[PDB]
Design a protein around this motif. Structure first.
Motif, short mmCIF file in Angstrom:
data_model
loop_
_atom_site.label_atom_id
_atom_site.label_comp_id
_atom_site.label_asym_id
_atom_site.label_seq_id
_atom_site.Cartn_x
_atom_site.Cartn_y
_atom_site.Cartn_z
N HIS D 160 0.84 -1.21 0.00
CA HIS D 160 0.00 0.00 0.00
C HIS D 160 0.87 1.25 0.00
O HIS D 160 1.93 1.26 0.61
CB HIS D 160 -0.90 -0.03 1.24
N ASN D 162 1.79 4.76 1.57
CA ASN D 162 1.64 5.71 2.70
C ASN D 162 1.11 7.00 2.15
O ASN D 162 1.20 7.31 0.93
CB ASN D 162 2.97 5.90 3.32
N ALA D 163 0.66 7.87 3.04
CA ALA D 163 0.20 9.19 2.64
C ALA D 163 1.20 10.03 2.00
O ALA D 163 0.86 10.90 1.18
CB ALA D 163 -0.41 9.87 3.88
N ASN D 209 -5.68 2.41 3.97
CA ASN D 209 -5.37 3.67 4.60
C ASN D 209 -6.67 4.26 5.24
O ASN D 209 -7.80 4.11 4.75
CB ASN D 209 -4.85 4.64 3.56
N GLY D 213 -4.60 9.39 6.80
CA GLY D 213 -3.34 9.00 6.19
C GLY D 213 -2.83 7.64 6.65
O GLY D 213 -2.28 6.86 5.75
N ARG D 214 -3.09 7.32 7.92
CA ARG D 214 -2.44 6.25 8.64
C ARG D 214 -2.79 4.89 8.03
O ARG D 214 -3.96 4.61 7.77
CB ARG D 214 -2.81 6.21 10.13
N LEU D 215 -1.78 4.04 7.85
CA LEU D 215 -2.12 2.70 7.37
C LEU D 215 -2.67 1.88 8.58
O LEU D 215 -2.19 2.03 9.71
CB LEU D 215 -0.84 2.02 6.88
N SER D 230 -2.30 -0.26 13.71
CA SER D 230 -2.23 0.89 12.86
C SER D 230 -1.03 1.76 13.13
O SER D 230 -0.43 1.81 14.19
CB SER D 230 -3.46 1.68 12.88
#
Ligand SMILES: [Ca+2]
Ligand SMILES: [Ca+2]
Ligand SMILES: [Ca+2]
Ligand SMILES: [Ca+2]
Ligand SMILES: [Ca+2]
Ligand SMILES: [Ca+2]
Ligand SMILES: [Ca+2]
Ligand SMILES: [Ca+2]
Ligand SMILES: [Cl-]
Ligand SMILES: [Cl-]
Ligand SMILES: [Cl-]
Ligand SMILES: [Cl-]
Ligand SMILES: [Hg+2]
Ligand SMILES: [Hg+2]
Ligand SMILES: [Hg+2]
Ligand SMILES: [Hg+2]
Ligand SMILES: [Hg+2]
Ligand SMILES: [Hg+2]
Lengths: 353, 353, 353, 353
Positions: D160, D162-163, D209, D213-215, D230
């Motif tokens: 994935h 990240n932001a 996400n 933002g946080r995965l 998380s």
């Protein structure tokens, strides 16, 4: 651990006085309740020294502040009856001496304050039901008769007010699940039926209110880790699923709401040191557990000082009471290391253990 | 409106007793303070009837509950000095009668409770500075000497505790801006310098704490609309920008935290009816104003019952006190319509108006 | 300022390419549209240099990325008709040259992408109504006929998708209030009636979506300060009250959602420097405005780089384009100071100004 | 279950086309990949019918949309090499046919899109390390050489953004714990070392996400319940503790962010029906699991339609694909019951199972 296990309890009960000074109550080797207090309201203060209440007791004592500021302590006597003692004036060390409430009890007493100023005490009775007894007028030594709420209990009870003023009580049942029961009208003797929250627990339940009103219940689970569940509405009947947090704990947990409104939980960890976890922002997620130096011999008992600083009490390996606290009023304050409140040693008089 | 205007005040001050019963204090046509209370703690209860304190007064009275549950009321005398009266026991209608605190005051008194249980009163003095005086022991009729905190005030003061236990005081200054000053240590006579929050206000400031600790200040602005500002940290010195909400208001606002933790503000609107706005979720945004039927003649005074139900008091066009409340404990409860608490009529004795 | 004023617009429109490289479009002194792009996708990259589209134009150009990654620019011609130009392949500088969409328009074009991949363009027509025209197949040069949505407009339109896929359009009306109109089914030509949001605005409206779906609209108000309003439900019809933020602004605002999901607004301030404000936590409150060094001559145009860094473009006092950006991907990143993207100078071709 | 177990996978991979139409890819009894699509972008639409790609395959296929809107599918061949097939134009059913990427792979392929528009594929190699290969120019059939990132994998990988634009990859290791590795600069071949997230998992990891933002990573744990962890900062290195949710699950989970920004997880439950849980407000807590009627034979595969409606695909007991969806765009929408997408039956070709 066995499903029927009850994780080690805290070794004192603690209250804030009318002036917010902390005061702790425990049972010594003489089987009497003793207490000690801060001389002034902050964690760095001198403590007065240990003072004895005459009388042999047979449970952990429970303390609450009345709505007129006077502390009142509840305990089981050698007669297995409930007794109580109060400050005769707020912020003073003059007490009534133990006075009888009778009954026959087989748990620690749990005391709550109704939203109309009346104390109310919950116990497991000789028949294993939950029983209660209450002040009939706020902050007055006038008490009701005993009344049963039924059920079959296998933990000490824990009680809390909902935001709407209705007391709700939590206790483990005969199936080792957490059950609960509630006032259906604020500060009134009109109660629901028992309902199950449907998880095994291996500690007493511990309950706190969040910022937004909602109750949250913590307990150790069957796998020895901390678990928790919360209300999701404006009712006693709709709750979240249970969640567990990794990390094996070896005592009851102790919860507190910090200065920012976020919850924190303290518990003895698998290594027998004090562990702490906190909500990392509004509504979670929970931090990894952090550990304080030093092997401890009870669950933590957590309190808040007049300035919002958190303070934690524990039994040491010397069987004496130790404490540590936040050095500043801040969610990220540093902490002191364990300091002794000496003069007596303590025993775990918890009835259900 | 002029920048120096002070929007119409509330016509009573209200407190919860030790048992949470509401009790209201105002000034009648005889220039005496009278009071009335709920007989039991819920909004639908019977009220006792209006009872008089002997003595002519010259300000709005202010009331607080002591840390021992006893209500205490503060007011200016015909001598322009501060006087006080207290319940001699919590939840009883036996009072001390007015007792002197001296001084020379030129505002309504504002009373706060320190985090160590001591009441503290703030006033504008004869020199236009903020002055204060405090209990020297919690919930005891032992008071300090008067002390000045300086400044030049042009509103009544408003005080609140920070989460950390430090009292902070807000007042309009000579530039019509909101200024503030604070304890730099909890419950201690050690104060900051005055700082400006840099907006004109046209009401007394009104302050409340949010769930997460942070103070929030409401006031009417130069354009006659509600504006507000909040703390953004864990300090008295970092705040948000000011925001205004559309809608012209014609009294002081009154803020309350609801059962869900969200803020609500009530104010007389441009049409002279009571208006209400609430935060639609955590931290805002604010709803459109909703209006209750009926022309009102003061700001609202807002309170919370033992079960969390909000109750609002106002002066009617008959010069009598009226109230309405939530019918259930719920953020979206329906409301009653205005009901009379009859037996006297009231006057606006606010000093700065 | 007058209620009918329209605060200074941004001087370029900006898009991200299929590879996230920023590309800017404006009108030079030759009355042609020129563009420039980052050679690689980050704020510190070299820019390609200014490239001209042949053709004289008479509005600010608007750009959108198609659902196949190809940029497409819309502008009014000297014939007052709508024209468009596209990249013939994503991430390449080969363009179609201006192609006609006809019509008769009296605003800047506003372009949106439907949730089914079709671009749609909104304009004020010669009759002052809102008109629109759309791709009939996603990312294809096949367009519908013109259609009217009625109304009487006095600003350029702004459009955004709701979370549910329904385009909603905002524009100032003949009463200087903000009005809006919406698809009642996602990506379908089925629209509501016009409704008023009931505040005067003195800029074009600027709209963005929050984290939680809800649209938020920003505009300058009658008092020259920033104001904003948001949706409070899952519908186009329930909105918050308007709030204003202190601080006089002198251009249109530009909003952006930062890396943490919080909103930020940029605007020229009363001192003619760029000002920035941000939400200090989830859902507000808003920070005090912070100022960047340097007098600016347009509104800011805000964009986000491939790594989430915010970048801001403005007209300088040399009539050239300047930019600055965050040095790291962080809500609290430091910023660069204004750097020049030289080679042409620009003019404000906005139709409604 | 054993710690080394891998819960049943989803039976198709699904993507949105450039116009948001859903399209599903699976492996039939002929060992070929087949696909089917919505004819128009909403859950109630007709589907085109199953279409075959020629060629025998030996993994679950993975699909992603390029930055130019064209779908591209990745799968392992009978040669154990990676192959890929793409739409030659967005939203069209003309495909390239399988083309070789070589290598030697021993997992399903995982495809991600960099923040600079380049696809990147992660696999377990013949040496049990994580390997990757990427487009060298966005949305172009120009690919890098294979490169190793080391490690020892025992699950399929999940990737994935990240932001901040940095790809991060998650996979189970030789200790059955979840491990992860990340780009240290956005869209650049510069990677961290492997780090452990320190819980056993018994499924592939699934990552999404959050709004802010946080995965967030979901997986089944050693006790067969859903667990999740998380990010708590703006970094790939600080994470929350793990939490588990009660309820035994019997497939991989599938996560989706709903229209309000809250997360939802779907999984086969202990009774072999589809279960769903959702966050009850911002950041949790999680609801009790709710169950849809009907026994299912794979994990769910979850998608979102053009209007935000959630749609869920599963293998039925007839070995055919079935789906259900939300009837309206709302977090509390009602759901359809299972409907058939008939014409082929499917097999679970997942390599690591
Ligand atoms: Ca009493
Ligand atoms: Ca009662
Ligand atoms: Ca006292
Ligand atoms: Ca003190
Ligand atoms: Ca195309
Ligand atoms: Ca459509
Ligand atoms: Ca391409
Ligand atoms: Ca790159
Ligand atoms: Cl309690
Ligand atoms: Cl106060
Ligand atoms: Cl748009
Ligand atoms: Cl991915
Ligand atoms: Hg309680
Ligand atoms: Hg939150
Ligand atoms: Hg106060
Ligand atoms: Hg929030
Ligand atoms: Hg748009
Ligand atoms: Hg990805």
């Amino acid at each position: 651990i066995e499903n029927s296990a009850i994780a080690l309890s805290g070794i004192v009960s603690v209250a804030n006085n009318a002036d917010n000074r902390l005061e702790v109550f425990g049972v010594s080797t003489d089987s009497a309740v003793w207490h000690n207090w801060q001389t002034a309201p902050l964690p760095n203060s001198s403590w007065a020294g240990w003072n004895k209440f005459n009388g042999v007791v047979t449970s952990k004592p429970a303390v609450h502040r009345n709505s007129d500021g006077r502390l009142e302590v509840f305990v089981r006597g050698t007669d297995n009856a409930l007794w109580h003692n109060w400050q005769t004036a707020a912020d003073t060390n003059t007490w009534s001496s133990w006075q009888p409430l009778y009954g026959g009890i087989t748990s620690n007493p749990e005391v709550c304050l109704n939203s109309d100023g009346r104390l109310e005490v919950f116990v497991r009775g000789s028949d294993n039901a939950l029983w209660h007894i209450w002040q009939t007028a706020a902050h007055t030594n006038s008490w009701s008769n005993w009344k049963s709420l039924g059920g079959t209990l296998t933990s000490n009870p824990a009680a809390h007010l909902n935001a709407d003023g209705r007391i709700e009580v939590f206790a483990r049942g005969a199936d080792n699940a957490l059950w609960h029961i509630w006032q259906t009208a604020a500060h009134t003797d009109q109660w629901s039926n028992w309902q199950s929250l449907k998880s095994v627990i291996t500690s007493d339940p511990v309950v706190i209110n969040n910022c937004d009103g909602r109750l949250e219940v913590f307990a150790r689970g069957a796998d020895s880790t901390l678990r928790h569940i919360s209300q999701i509405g404006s009712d006693s009947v709709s709750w979240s699923n249970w969640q567990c947090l990794d990390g094996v704990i070896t005592s009851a947990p102790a919860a507190v709401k910090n200065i920012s409104g976020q919850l924190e939980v303290f518990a003895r960890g698998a290594d027998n040191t004090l562990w702490r976890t906190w909500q990392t922002s509004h509504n979670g997620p929970w931090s990894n557990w952090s550990s304080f130096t030093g092997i401890i011999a009870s669950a933590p008992t957590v309190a808040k000082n007049s300035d919002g600083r958190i303070e934690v009490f524990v039994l040491g390996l010397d069987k004496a009471l130790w404490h540590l606290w936040q050095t500043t009023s801040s969610t990220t304050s540093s902490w002191t290391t364990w300091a002794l409140i000496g003069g007596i040693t303590l025993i775990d008089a918890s009835v259900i253990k």
